Amino acid sequence: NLVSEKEFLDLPLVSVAEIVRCRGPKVSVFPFDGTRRWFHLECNPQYDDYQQAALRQSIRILKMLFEHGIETVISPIFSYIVQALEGMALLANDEEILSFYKEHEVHVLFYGDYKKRLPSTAQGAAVVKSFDDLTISTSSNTEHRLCFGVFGNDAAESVAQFSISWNETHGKPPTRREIIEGYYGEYVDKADMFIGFGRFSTFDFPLLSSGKTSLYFTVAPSYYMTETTLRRILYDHIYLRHFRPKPDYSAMSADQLNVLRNRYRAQPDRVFGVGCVHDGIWFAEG
Amino acid sequence: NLVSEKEFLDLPLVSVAEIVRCRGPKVSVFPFDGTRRWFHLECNPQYDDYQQAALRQSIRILKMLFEHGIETVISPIFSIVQALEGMALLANDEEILSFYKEHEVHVLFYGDYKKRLPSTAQGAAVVKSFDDLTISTSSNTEHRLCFGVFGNDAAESVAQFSISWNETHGKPPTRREIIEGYYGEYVDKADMFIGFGRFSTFDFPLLSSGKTSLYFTVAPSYYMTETTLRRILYDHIYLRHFRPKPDYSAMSADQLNVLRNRYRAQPDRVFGVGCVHDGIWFA
Ligand SMILES: [Mg+2]
Numbered sequence: 001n002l003v004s005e006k007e008f009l010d011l012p013l014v015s016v017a018e019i020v021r022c023r024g025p026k027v028s029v030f031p032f033d034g035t036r037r038w039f040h041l042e043c044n045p046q047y048d049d050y051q052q053a054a055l056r057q058s059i060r061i062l063k064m065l066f067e068h069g070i071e072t073v074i075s076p077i078f079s080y081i082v083q084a085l086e087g088m089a090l091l092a093n094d095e096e097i098l099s100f101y102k103e104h105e106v107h108v109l110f111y112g113d114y115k116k117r118l119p120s121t122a123q124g125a126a127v128v129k130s131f132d133d134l135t136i137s138t139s140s141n142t143e144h145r146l147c148f149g150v151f152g153n154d155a156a157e158s159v160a161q162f163s164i165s166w167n168e169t170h171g172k173p174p175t176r177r178e179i180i181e182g183y184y185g186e187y188v189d190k191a192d193m194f195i196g197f198g199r200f201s202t203f204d205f206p207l208l209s210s211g212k213t214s215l216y217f218t219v220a221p222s223y224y225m226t227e228t229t230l231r232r233i234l235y236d237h238i239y240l241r242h243f244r245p246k247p248d249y250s251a252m253s254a255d256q257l258n259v260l261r262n263r264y265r266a267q268p269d270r271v272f273g274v275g276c277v278h279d280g281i282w283f284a285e286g
Numbered sequence: 287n288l289v290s291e292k293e294f295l296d297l298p299l300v301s302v303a304e305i306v307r308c309r310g311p312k313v314s315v316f317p318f319d320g321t322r323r324w325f326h327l328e329c330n331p332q333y334d335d336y337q338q339a340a341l342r343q344s345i346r347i348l349k350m351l352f353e354h355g356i357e358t359v360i361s362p363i364f365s366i367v368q369a370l371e372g373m374a375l376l377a378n379d380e381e382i383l384s385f386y387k388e389h390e391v392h393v394l395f396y397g398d399y400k401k402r403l404p405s406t407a408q409g410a411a412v413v414k415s416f417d418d419l420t421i422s423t424s425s426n427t428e429h430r431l432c433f434g435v436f437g438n439d440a441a442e443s444v445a446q447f448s449i450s451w452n453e454t455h456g457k458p459p460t461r462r463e464i465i466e467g468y469y470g471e472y473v474d475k476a477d478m479f480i481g482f483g484r485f486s487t488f489d490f491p492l493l494s495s496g497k498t499s500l501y502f503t504v505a506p507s508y509y510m511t512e513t514t515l516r517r518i519l520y521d522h523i524y525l526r527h528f529r530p531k532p533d534y535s536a537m538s539a540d541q542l543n544v545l546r547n548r549y550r551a552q553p554d555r556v557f558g559v560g561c562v563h564d565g566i567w568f569a
Pocket residue numbers: 031032033195196197
C-alpha cells in the first residue's frame with residue numbers, strides 16, 4: 001500500500017476506515033488527559049460548564065476514532081469526587097452521548113475495581129448501577145466497542161479471584177482469552193496503540209499491552225486533537241512502525257552506514273522522554 | 287534539593303548514587319535493544335564475536351546502573367541456538383559471574399522459559415543454569431537483577447498460580463504474593479523504562495504504572511554513556527514530579543497566550559510519530 005503521509009491525509013474518511021479495518025489499529029487506548037490545562041486555555045473557567053465542555057470534546061474525539069475505522073477504543077476515565085462521579089454519570093445518562101452510542105452502534109463496557117473503590121454512598125451506588133445498565137442497553141450494538149476504565153490499573157487480584165471461581169465451575173484454568181473477557185466483559189485483542197500526553201507514561205489497559213503496542217505522546221492536551229493529528233499518528237502506525245523491507249544493514253551503502261554511525265556517536269545522549277520544565281510545565285525536549 | 291541539570295551532571299558519582307537511593311528509581315527496566323545494528327556499526331562482523339562483544343557491553347551498562355544507586359534492574363533478554371548461547375553466558379561466563387559477586391547482585395529469572403525453551407539437552411541445561419545462578423548469588427543483597435526470558439504476558443501464569451495458591455491456602459493470593467510468585471521475590475513497580483527507537487515497552491508484567499517514567503533512546507542501547515544515563519535520572523528525579531504543580535488558575539495573561547499559541551499553532555506535534563530514512567525509523 002505504497003502511500004505518502006500527505007496522500008494518506010488527503011484520502012476520504014471512508015477510505016481511511018477501510019485501510020484501518022484491514023491494517024489496524026483494531027484496539028486503541030486513548031485517555032483524555034490534560035483537560036484541566038485545556039479548560040483554562042480554551043474555555044472561560046469563570047462561567048463555562050467544565051463537565052459539559054469536557055463531555056462535548058470526549059464525544060467529538062470518540063466519534064473521530066470510530067469513523068476512522070477503529071473497532072475498540074479503551075479510555076481510562078478515572079485512575080472533588082462528587083464532581084468526579086458526576087462526570088462518570090454523564091457518560092451513561094447524557095442524552096447527546098447516548099444518541100452517539102446509538103447512532104454509531106457502540107457497545108459500552110466498564111472495567112476496573114470501581115464496584116469496590118467507588119464511594120459507598122447514594123451517588124456512588126447510582127454510578128455503579130448506571131454503568132451496568134448502559135452495558136446492558138447498548139449490548140445490541142455491534143459496530144464498535146468502548147471500554148471506560150474506572151480504577152482499572154492493577155488487575156492482578158481480580159484475575160486471581162476470577163481464575164479461582166472459573167476453575168471451580170469448569171474444572172480447569174481459564175485461557176488467556178477467557179481471562180481478558182472476564183476482566184473487560186468481552187474478549188479484546190492487545191492494544192495496537194496508546195495515545196498519551198505530556199510526560200511519557202502509559203496506564204490502565206492491564207493485560208492488553210505488548211511490545212507491539214505503538215506508543216505516542218501528544219504535546220498538547222488531548223482535547224486539542226484534530227483529524228489531521230490522528231491521521232499522522234495512524235500513518236506512522238500503519239506504514240512506519242512496521243516498514244518493509246525490514247532493515248538489512250548487511251546491505252546498506254558504506255556512506256549511509258557511516259552517517260548513521262556518526263549520528264549515534266555524536267548524540268549518544270539524545271533521549272526522547274527527557275524534557276525540561278517551564279513555569280511548572282513539563283515539555284518533551286524534541 | 288534544588289539542582290539544575292548542569293549541576294547534576296557535574297556531581298561526583300558518590301553524590302549521585304546517594305540521591306538515587308533516596309529518591310529513586312529503585313526499580314528500572316532496561317532491555318538492551320538494537321544490538322545487531324550496534325554490532326554492524328561498531329564491530330568488525332568479519333572477525334569479532336557477536337555474543338562476547340554484546341556481553342561485554344551488557345556488563346558495562348549493568349555496572350553503570352548499579353553504581354548509580356539503582357537497586358533493582360529488570361532486563362528482558364528474550365521473547366535460536368545462539369539465543370541460548372547468550373543465555374548460557376549469563377550464568378556461566380567467568381567475567382559476568384565475577385560481576386554478580388563484585389557488585390553483590392542477586393540474579394533471578396522470570397517468564398515462561400521453563401516451558402518454552404527447547405525440550406532438548408542444551409535447553410534443559412540453560413534452565414538448570416538459571417536455577418543454579420539464582421542459588422549461587424542468593425547471599426548477595428545489594429542489588430537485584432531480573433532477567434526476562436519469555437516474560438511477555440503473565441495472564442495464564444497468574445491464573446494457574448492463583449488456583450494452586452487457593453488450594454494450598456484456602457484463600458486467593460494478594461497482589462504482593464502474586465508478584466513474589468512471578469518474579470521469585472517481591473519487586474516494587476517499575477519507576478522507569480528505558481527504551482529504544484520506535485516508542486514501545488515490554489516484558490515487565492504486573493510492574494507497570496502510570497508513575498513509570500518512559501524514555502526512548504535514538505541510538506542502540508550500547509551507545510549509552512554516563513551523561514545519557516544521568517540525563518534520564520535527572521529528568522525522572524527532578525522533572526517528572528516537579529513542584530509546585532502548575533497553577534493556571536493564577537498564571538499571567540501573557541503566559542496563557544504563550545501556551546495557547548504553542549498548542550494552537552502546532553496542533554499536531556506528537557512524539558512517537560516519526561519518519562523512515564533508508565529503512566530506519568527515526569523519531
Ligand atoms: Mg495520557
